[PDB]
Amino acid sequence: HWGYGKHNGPEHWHKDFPIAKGERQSPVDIDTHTAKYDPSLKPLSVSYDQATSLRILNNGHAFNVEFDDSQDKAVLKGGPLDGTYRLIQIHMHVGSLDGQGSEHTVDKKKYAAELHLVHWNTKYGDFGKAVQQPDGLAVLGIFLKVGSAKPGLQKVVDVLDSIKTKGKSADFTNFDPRGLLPESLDYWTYPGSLTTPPLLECVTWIVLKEPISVSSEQVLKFRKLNFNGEGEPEELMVDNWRPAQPLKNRQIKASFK
Numbered sequence: 001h002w003g004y005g006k007h008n009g010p011e012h013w014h015k016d017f018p019i020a021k022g023e024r025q026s027p028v029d030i031d032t033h034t035a036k037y038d039p040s041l042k043p044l045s046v047s048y049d050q051a052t053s054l055r056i057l058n059n060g061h062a063f064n065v066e067f068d069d070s071q072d073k074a075v076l077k078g079g080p081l082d083g084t085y086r087l088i089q090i091h092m093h094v095g096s097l098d099g100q101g102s103e104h105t106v107d108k109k110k111y112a113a114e115l116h117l118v119h120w121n122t123k124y125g126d127f128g129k130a131v132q133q134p135d136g137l138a139v140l141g142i143f144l145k146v147g148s149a150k151p152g153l154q155k156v157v158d159v160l161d162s163i164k165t166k167g168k169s170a171d172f173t174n175f176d177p178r179g180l181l182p183e184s185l186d187y188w189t190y191p192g193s194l195t196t197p198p199l200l201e202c203v204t205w206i207v208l209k210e211p212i213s214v215s216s217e218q219v220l221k222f223r224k225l226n227f228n229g230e231g232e233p234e235e236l237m238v239d240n241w242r243p244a245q246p247l248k249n250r251q252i253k254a255s256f257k
């Protein structure tokens, strides 16, 4: 199996999933001084108006909000993308200390957490088929930094008690993901992979420059989930992040100067 522990952590993943040592693995450190600004990139289009959330679940790796992706309700397009990408899931990578938690780093700096809004290319029929394509997924990464409480996240915060342990799930309809975005849509983009097994290199990464803020109380609560199942020794779901991987010969582009 796999996890974030000493014996099944990121350093062990390559034995079950050889692609862990591939050419386009994620996350990566974003060196703001070498990223290439590209004014040819069309603007990032986020259309979450009729988004329809379904459930929130603790799969032992993170909390996950699942959406109905049977139609073009909550979609992502524009930016470096060709076609339409449907939102299917949102989860969070969180640290144990405010100075760590994010998967992507900026000039080596790590944020307290990182939200990943996963979308898949509609020209592929469904998510399962999409992950098998180099351009099958588009994942929006949003950093979290301590500040004023974030209303959009309080919705999640308010339900955490119900999904404390691995396998627990709860109804999570009428959740508006628009509430998870910072003011600016400026971003960095590069070709990468899923950051948890199977680690398929099928995603176009779009990492927002502006982190959203969350209150200390909110962050504390997001660290109260468990990796373990109910009844087993309690293992706090903290530091469920994969460290930065070798960029190799990939170019990180910026949508802003």
Ligand SMILES: [Cu+2]
Residues within 6 Å of the ligand: 091, 093, 116, 195
């Ligand atoms: Cu993720």
